[PDB]
Amino acid sequence: QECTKFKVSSCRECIESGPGCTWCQKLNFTGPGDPDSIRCDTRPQLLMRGCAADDIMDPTSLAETQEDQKQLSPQKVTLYLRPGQAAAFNVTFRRAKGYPIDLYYLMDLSYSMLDDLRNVKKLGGDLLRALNEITESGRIGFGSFVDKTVLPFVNTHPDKLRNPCPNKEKECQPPFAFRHVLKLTDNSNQFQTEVGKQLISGNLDAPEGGLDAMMQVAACPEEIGWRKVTRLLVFATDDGFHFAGDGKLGAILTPNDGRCHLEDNLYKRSNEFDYPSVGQLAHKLAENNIQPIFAVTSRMVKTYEKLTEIIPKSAVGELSEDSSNVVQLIKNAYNKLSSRVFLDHNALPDTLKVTYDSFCSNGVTHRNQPRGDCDGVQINVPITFQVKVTATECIQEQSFVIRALGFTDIVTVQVLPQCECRCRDRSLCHGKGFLECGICRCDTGYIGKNCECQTQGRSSQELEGSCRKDNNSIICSGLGDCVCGQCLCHTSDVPGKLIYGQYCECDTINCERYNGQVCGGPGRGLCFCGKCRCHPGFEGSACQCERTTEGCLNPRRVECSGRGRCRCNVCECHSGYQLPLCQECPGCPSPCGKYISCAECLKFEKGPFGKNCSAACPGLQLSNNPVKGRTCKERDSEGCWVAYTLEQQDGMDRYLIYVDESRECCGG
Amino acid sequence: FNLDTEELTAFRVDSAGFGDSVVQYANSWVVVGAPQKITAADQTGGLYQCGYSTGACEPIGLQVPPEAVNMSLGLSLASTTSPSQLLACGPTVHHECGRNMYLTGLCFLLGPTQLTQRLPVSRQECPRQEQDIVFLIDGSGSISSRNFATMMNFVRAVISQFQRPSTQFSLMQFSNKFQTHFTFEEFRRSSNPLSLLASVHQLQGFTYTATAIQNVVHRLFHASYGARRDAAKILIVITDGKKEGDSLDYKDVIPMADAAGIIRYAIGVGLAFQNRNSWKELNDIASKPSQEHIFKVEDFDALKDIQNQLKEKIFAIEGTETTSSSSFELEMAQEGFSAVFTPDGPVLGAVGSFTWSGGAFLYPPNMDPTFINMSQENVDMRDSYLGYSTELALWKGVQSLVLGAPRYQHTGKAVIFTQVSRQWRMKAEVTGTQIGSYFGASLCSVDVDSDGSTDLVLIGAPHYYEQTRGGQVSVCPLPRGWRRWWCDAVLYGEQGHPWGRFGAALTVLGDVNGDKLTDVVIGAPGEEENRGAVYLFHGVLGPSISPSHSQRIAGSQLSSRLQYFGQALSGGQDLTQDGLVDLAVGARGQVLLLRTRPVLWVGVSMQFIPAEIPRSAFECREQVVSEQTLVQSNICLYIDKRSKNLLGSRDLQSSVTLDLALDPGRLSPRATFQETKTRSLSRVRVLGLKAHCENFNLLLPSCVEDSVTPITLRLNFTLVGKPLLAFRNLRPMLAADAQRYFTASLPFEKNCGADHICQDNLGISFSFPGLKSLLVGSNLELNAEVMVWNDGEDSYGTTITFSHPAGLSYRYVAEGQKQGQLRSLHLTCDSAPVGSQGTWSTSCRINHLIFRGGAQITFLATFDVSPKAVLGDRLLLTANVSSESNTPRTSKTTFQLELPVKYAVYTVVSSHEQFTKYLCFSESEEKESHVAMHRYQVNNLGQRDLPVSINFWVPVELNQEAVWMDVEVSHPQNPSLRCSSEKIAPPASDFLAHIQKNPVLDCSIAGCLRFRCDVPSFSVQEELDFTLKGNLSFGWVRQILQKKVSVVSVAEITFDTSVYSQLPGQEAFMRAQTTTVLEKYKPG
Ligand SMILES: *[C@@H]1O[C@H](CO)[C@@H](O[C@@H]2O[C@H](CO)[C@@H](O[C@@H]3O[C@H](CO[C@H]4O[C@H](CO)[C@@H](O)[C@H](O[C@H]5O[C@H](CO)[C@@H](O)[C@H](O)[C@@H]5O)[C@@H]4O)[C@@H](O)[C@H](O[C@H]4O[C@H](CO)[C@@H](O)[C@H](O)[C@@H]4O[C@H]4O[C@H](CO)[C@@H](O)[C@H](O)[C@@H]4O)[C@@H]3O)[C@H](O)[C@H]2NC(C)=O)[C@H](O)[C@H]1NC(C)=O
Ligand SMILES: *[C@@H]1O[C@H](CO)[C@@H](O[C@@H]2O[C@H](CO)[C@@H](O[C@@H]3O[C@H](CO)[C@@H](O)[C@H](O)[C@@H]3O)[C@H](O)[C@H]2NC(C)=O)[C@H](O)[C@H]1NC(C)=O
Ligand SMILES: *[C@@H]1O[C@H](CO)[C@@H](O[C@@H]2O[C@H](CO)[C@@H](O)[C@H](O)[C@H]2NC(C)=O)[C@H](O)[C@H]1NC(C)=O
Ligand SMILES: *[C@@H]1O[C@H](CO)[C@@H](O[C@@H]2O[C@H](CO)[C@@H](O)[C@H](O)[C@H]2NC(C)=O)[C@H](O)[C@H]1NC(C)=O
Ligand SMILES: *[C@@H]1O[C@H](CO)[C@@H](O[C@@H]2O[C@H](CO)[C@@H](O)[C@H](O)[C@H]2NC(C)=O)[C@H](O)[C@H]1NC(C)=O
Ligand SMILES: *[C@@H]1O[C@H](CO)[C@@H](O[C@@H]2O[C@H](CO)[C@@H](O)[C@H](O)[C@H]2NC(C)=O)[C@H](O)[C@H]1NC(C)=O
Ligand SMILES: *[C@@H]1O[C@H](CO)[C@@H](O)[C@H](O)[C@H]1NC(C)=O
Ligand SMILES: [Ca+2]
Ligand SMILES: [Ca+2]
Ligand SMILES: [Ca+2]
Ligand SMILES: [Ca+2]
Ligand SMILES: [Ca+2]
Ligand SMILES: [Cl-]
Ligand SMILES: [Mg+2]
């Protein structure tokens, strides 16, 4: 294929040079004048010069699989990695019909949840029914939260502390951060009676300390009573949430320690710690394999939906204002969790690059992704991820785990390096050096293919002819010393600079510069004699371009609207649409004039575009209600003025048109 | 890199919360807050000032009001050096109003030349209950002089005991005659209310007490008399308790008073209390419970003791509109949560204002405080914590205020405010990307080039979460012109700290490396499991902050006891008396004062005597090892200090270690030092500032193998600055990015003929393939076809040197070894500044190659053109050619070429959506006309400001008959402009023939009116709006013989074509037209 010639003295040095580099071990494959540099080259240029097909040494990346759990297979893989060459193996995911499920229900007791808390009797049976419908063997339990009991979060006046509700209701409860009411239990009647027992509380500001409660639940698996089964946390609220930083208003500067603070089933020291960070909560949830379900009112759905990007295994469901639809919510939310499967890996070194190819039953295929992603995953219908692992170096003894997010089941991957030849005689090499893999490897001080010379010695004439590239060149490029016919390159003491090549004509610092570094620095790629060889995940002449397209797409995954294609994470927008995502074009002409016939077609069913219509107006969608686009008024087929509006949509010249039914004539 | 981590100052105080907030003050102290320290009974928070000489901390004494409960004083600090001032705030003041607990704030303004004052100047008020109080006083004949006088003194007392306009009063004296001395309306309008009581005289007469009460109840408590509906109604009857002559009794009038909700006090005069008849009378008048509403006329404290009342406020908690509750306004404002000094006065952030929508109060000296926030219409701003952070920006001379709102939509955002007229209004906004990231938790204005104007605003998002690292700082440069504010780049700390809280604290340190570019410091108190760290970032031209930090300081690096190192920052002042700026860093229970070290720069010049090795030196007439040749080496070091404000002795002692190497990396070195008899030598000397030179003798062997490549001498050094004894052993250090390896070359004479010194002529020439001119902004690169030739003897080490202004820069492009010959030429280049300042030189050196006789070489040199290039109208590129052998030169063959330069701009004019589309007129309206408008808008969509002229072409006549009457061009928005008119007669032709082709009246056949509106400066993203408004007549249409005709106006943009070029391909958009259609009709 392709081979950069970096170090050619050895076989391993040849293999390390590039993945397309191969080695010839045939003795006396070299001509009398030919160097040993021709021993290392690609396969098309090796066999062609007369090298045998059998004695060509070409290590190749290999994946060993031992399959001999149920969901995630294979359960163990050992990789043999060659630098630059990718090894690939398949991981299979089969969604089971049923798992045991622990359902913990975090209940908001703030005064704003008054009407949701009038349904507590029904809530007991509903939550039980929801769990029974998604599980054959499940446990249930719950806890309650309001907010931190300091100002401004809570009115700390003695009177308001015993009755925080704004109205005068006898059945009220003093504010509290978080209370663990019932440990996960199989007792149904205990759950029902304890849930209905709960009273309404209240506090001052709208967002609540729910993140506090969720952090404590995730940090106390003992007191909550989690099993090693599927863990579900249902979070129900009508408003937003405090997070880290907000505590400063109550003079609270000490970070959440992610540790369990439960005294008598209470978060007593809540006024001593700040609210948890969102990332702080996300980590603790994934660490204990807890999939939270956010049961929020319609008002708060779009907000909590933003969380699912930080917390991969979570789901949002729209909660009725009375918390009556909780069952239908939980089942849909659980199915949403289970119908999507993520395949990720833990910590890697800089020398290991892993990407996934997702093959879904969904009818969608993803390739070259940092994480396995399949939506619409069905029960008993197996999906297969293809894992491609590449090493940039000859690596040490390492092992990492590939895991399906939301499940304790793992895939253990052992990583073994494949850099050597295992090829496929003494006193040969006419001196000191010992023969190795088709050539003599000389000792220190001695050098030559048959070790017939020494660096310090005669170094005569006529052999200096092979030290010149051509008649106009300086001997050994002036960057090396001619010894025994070959070139021994000079050693420059500069960070990263090495001179190599048959005539010492190549170096490692002369290439294109990105940012301020050559080839984008050691992060993006390395430089080899004029050309930049990029690391996996990078490409370009200066390794300036990045492969991912996440920077080109909008949150709705539109990919530079429909008016630009992505290159190097920069949307290349045709026409006059501007950056970043090509939504708007400020200096475009007005579209109004040319859609008058289409406007007359859609609304009034006449003009040149009657029966013509759907075929003649592909990019126009009609709205019988006013739209938020640009105003237009033109003369139709019979001369009357037709008013209409154009709201542009994603794509090439596609608009949402609203036409007024009232035309304007001089009649009328 | 020059932050001192060894010699250091650490302040420790036992007080709770010490180090939570720090600030440098008056170039003397580090002021440190300890918000959680209990200083007294129901008081928290303490201040400390910390000195460098003393190395200890002393508390700052402040008279704290008893009204200020648990302020958490020192939670936020601020200072300025205009006049040296300190601001220390306690934003958690607990204020008890009724059974509600309020959370306000209190700040203290300190200064050496001023007395300590407080902000806000007034104590927070509790909601007072409105009460309409009516005095009804007995002026009957039974009341006698002093008794009446005492009654009036009672009135004077009570009125003085109640605040306005919470309480307001009304006075009616009664007898058998009634007189209302003042009503609630009159009282409300009074400057001095107590002046109304001076005129009151007794009426004598009888005593109609019952009827008087009825009169009062029926009249004085009406809105027409100035009474308030929501106010508590109070009636104070002052009588001697003997009612004589009244045809009414209290049984008749009091039930009505009770139904009206009127609280009634019976104040007794004289014998009123002892007599049984009088006592019952007082009981009937007074409300229940009776004894609580009856008092002596002598008791002036009677009422006050009962009420100085508050109206209880029911809060709309958790956004609940129901429960008949009022909404949050300034109750939970927490004034002083953040603070900054501005030229017009100090600014205090108020996070809790209006359902935590936030904002900030400006407190101008000797004026009414103004409140800065988002408009009421912005409901989304609720619970956004605007004013969590506060920073001052200066766009030029304009005073701008930046407020952070880290909770806005759970993602956070920052808003800039400026003053228009006397009103504070939003100018720009910028929003965070990740939810929970707390975008806008910290702000920092940076003046990178130190011109006095803010170039850039750093915005902290401490809780930004990536899987590997945590915390993020956005670099948000203040937008030029009408451009939108957005974040140009982002800054990160080192990886491995997912909750490192990078960006929790920001500060400007000043220029520490002497590149005249302001540098900043970002704190990361959560790194290494809450041990903390601090980052130093350099400033960069074209104002941005460097992506990578110059220095990182971990808390663990300094001490094992450090926690939350970097939670608070403050730099820019010199507190160690050395002239260099110092940084104050906060930590848990500690505050550290780090100092910056003086930076040195070392220049190197190396030359040989002789400059080239004579051919006599190397020639083997045998005795193969023979007398060596001598070459003298002159090495000069130049040491100047980069830190210019360093106080002390002018000379800085420094220990310099030299390492010399002859032909390094070579098997056989072709020279040796006479001193060491090898190719290596070392010198250790102590040098002062500026120049120092030394000579080294080189020995060249009698015979050598390689006489082609020049002998190289490599010098590299280390520098350890001697400690300044005056500043606690402060050590000068070399710049981190300084070049340490220097190389001189010693060339050999070349042998051409027999004893014939080589002579090479070298010529250079280059053209610009493809373009005759350069359009800056549209041409991002410039290719030159460069040809060099040698018509003589061979030249070794041939070099080509380009010279050009700053806007241009050489770019190595790589596409080679394709099938065929891309193998030909190899080059090595580097770019460096040359001249006084402003010009640059890139020298490309051709090695591997012996440049032989007659042969010539050509290649493609590519230069990058900056879209912000300052080239002017002409660009000059010069190319010098030279070789290893230094010929006498000055033989010209130094080529230069100048190139025409224009500047790319993008301007567009367009027809607005809102204009007169058509006019319908009947056959009998020939005499009539109607108003018609044509609107255009002009936009600058380019990257460059420029002067423009907009021309308008309006048809006003057809064959001397009026078409468009009294056309006036208006620009209501942005009006400071001009518009000149020029009548234009049309080129004559058959107008009927022209109309017949297409029913259009344009400037070709009609008399036109040409408007010219000059714009001195058309800013980027600026939108101009013009309107052509006049009366459109129907009479002229009669000549045309068409039922409908189109009237067309034309707008066109023009500018200096010699200096500017419209963005290629967009020339068409510099012209626009609008059409009004006249259409006739009969009845159907
Ligand atoms: C940024 O800060 C600004 C302030 O600088 C905030 O804007 C303020 O918001 C408050 C409360 O939302 C407003 O107070 C209310 O004022 C009502 C009367 O308005 C008139 O007086 C004020 C006095 O300053 C003037 O400013 C007003 O100016 C008007 O003209 C301008 C210019 O055109 C307009 O833009 C304004 O919109 C105004 O129209 C007026 O002259 C008053 O009725 C109201 O009183 C009720 O609410 C308070 C609690 O807040 C109770 O104590 C009180 O008793 C009333 O509540 C009872 O009655 C209602 C009746 O329905 C019941 O529903 C209740 O339950 C309860 O029983 C209040 O005092 C203030 O006017 C306004 N100022 C401005 C300049 O807009 C912004 O909100 C803030 N930004 C954000 C994003 O919040
Ligand atoms: C201002 O801050 C001080 C210092 O924190 C507050 O003092 C504290 O006052 C509360 C009053 O409720 C004390 O709480 C009490 O504690 C005992 C046992 O802990 C409990 O049984 C009682 O029922 C009561 O809740 C608290 O001990 C006390 N702290 C100290 C250190 O003395 C003060 O209350 C604050 N002022 C306001 C107006 O909030
Ligand atoms: C892992 O599974 C995928 C399934 O797609 C394999 O890719 C297929 O390879 C076969 C031949 O081996 C082709 O006929 C298919 O068209 C491929 N599928 C796709 C979608 O490209 C892949 O080879 C498997 N890898 C291993 C190591 O077993
Ligand atoms: C809809 O039908 C109309 C006519 O029935 C088509 O428009 C014609 O396009 C041809 C193109 O060569 C012109 O020569 C005609 O003059 C047009 N007709 C009219 C009435 O103007 C149109 O192409 C059809 N559209 C589709 C999608 O089939
Ligand atoms: C001049 O440069 C040489 C080469 O880098 C320096 O010597 C090296 O010192 C480093 C540590 O500082 C060692 O790791 C290398 O092995 C050394 N190289 C050699 C060839 O010994 C030398 O210190 C420099 N001298 C000065 C004064 O800066
Ligand atoms: C310019 O046109 C306006 C109409 O836009 C004229 O205003 C009308 O004047 C007549 C008087 O002859 C009134 O009867 C109409 O009611 C007016 N219309 C409106 C909308 O106000 C105006 O008179 C014209 N100006 C001139 C100089 O003729
Ligand atoms: C000409 O090029 C030489 C390069 O050797 C440079 O030193 C010199 O300054 C140049 N002269 C001008 C005028 O740029
Ligand atoms: Ca709350
Ligand atoms: Ca609800
Ligand atoms: Ca500036
Ligand atoms: Ca600097
Ligand atoms: Ca200092
Ligand atoms: Cl009387
Ligand atoms: Mg609530």
Ligand SMILES: [Mg+2]
């Ligand atoms: Mg009397």
Ligand code: NA
């Ligand atoms: Na509030």
